Amino acid sequence: PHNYLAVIKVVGIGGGGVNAVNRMIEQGLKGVEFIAINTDAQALLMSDADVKLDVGRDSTRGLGAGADPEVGRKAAEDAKDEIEELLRGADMVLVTAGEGGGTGTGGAPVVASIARKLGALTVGVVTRPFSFEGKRRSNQAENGIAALRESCDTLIVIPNDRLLQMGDAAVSLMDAFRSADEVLLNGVQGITDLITTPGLINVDFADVKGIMSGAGTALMGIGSARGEGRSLKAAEIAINSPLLEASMEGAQGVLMSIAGGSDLGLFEINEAASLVQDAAHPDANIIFGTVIDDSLGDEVRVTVIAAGF
Template identity: 65%
Template structure:
């Protein structure tokens, strides 16, 4: 007999802190998607952008340093801003069992402040997971270089760091996709990375995980990768699982991972057979010695869709670098169906006011309102906090 014991889950305090433009935008996405059981915090150096955030807790950092005008795409300013506001950051993070720090790497506030914030969360005893994006190549060498430094600092500050390579998104969207939609895609994947984990603890489902399960997979595990698969129809469970483990976002094969966390989300018609089918496919692609846990979440809004999210942890840096330079073997799935992964995302895009997209068109004006720090937020939302 199956027993659904969520007593442990109810005790786990999960906080999601979005830092800078990309992070704030990811928080807004989660709020709009009705993510449950987590506390949202928006942090920014830009006071005007922060006022537009939908998070219940909004914290302006570095007010003395930046006077509320942003970090000017300078990570050092972002870092000093977080250090200036350390006491306030400690206050909003205190009491959390798990903290997600999400940001876009390459600009000023997210790149500089996120590692400081992650370190504070970890010092307070929280399981700390970073979910960040690596910028598109077309965003320029300066932003790429700054992102490398920020990612390196994040690795030293978190238990597990999930890095989402924006360039890989170009492989799963249509070639005619406008640039602004490509940025929206990156922001949405940040949301999916956090929600794929937090839902397993905080949202009732067929198979729930407690906080200890997640901590086992993600504590002190270093680099991690994420794959997402979405499918409908008769074989939706197996197709979604295959897409997840062959996702371009997953830069290397999951058989090099020491731990795998899997989320299978579906509507009210999701069956235990489908959950088992998807889990078997992911398990068969993993190393025999891998520590794999999975859970299943019910989302009434999905109807016929199944979403499989795979978080693979514990990669060695050597293995990641080697596999990134080696093409991944493709699974026997229909690649033409990949664009359907974006269906729920495209529905959200229609809601975006285009006037908020204009600042991205002047990417060379780095200093104005920290445009490179908040590319996602200005592009995607009325909030750019």
């Protein structure tokens, strides 16, 4: 095998998607070309993405979609040519969005469908809305997730409800949607940083493509720790993450990443790798990799993507 660089693109769509891509920029996600997409023209113009694109100006005059998914879709199908060339020749496209709105919910299945005809491995990373946003938002989101899982290879759904504790005690509204911005970041960063920033144990691109092709919907767990025993306290928190909905024991596909400085020893790596093979189904397919980040200092971060129940 000669050397090969995987070209990876991360497209946020809708306000929620673009706000999260903004958080990826600020925290320095790399190896990836960012792409913001919205109908709100005002919201696009402070996206810090390398590529922006408004959809169906005639349809909206640049106002949004008014919480109506079926026009959020039509705006994207009539930018299909602009999208298909923004993504020409990618090996992996990740679609981010908060689900429940109009453009994200409606547009995301279209982006993902385009990336999958282009032969790219297409992974969706989305949130379920908070319960306090009403039932119409929850119904519309559940219709977008159904639409999108049929246009993806893997769809990671994150329940915002379980961020609320697992967060702070006295959270605020602004804080809550900030938390959801970092979770989406943890979702795509958990995946891409295996390809683009491998550590001691490096997974190739085609191992990721193997477990994640046709995987259906998936969930995620995160955890972090410092000190001695850091690697398996973090891996413990990841297996028991509210975000994972205790779905670990019965998952047939699992992609795990452990992130740490170059100070990360083989022994730490091995105990965390063992604790997740133990907590997984015995017939489960597990692919696992180390990630190098000298900026976390003492902290170790574990991330678990579980698919196919």
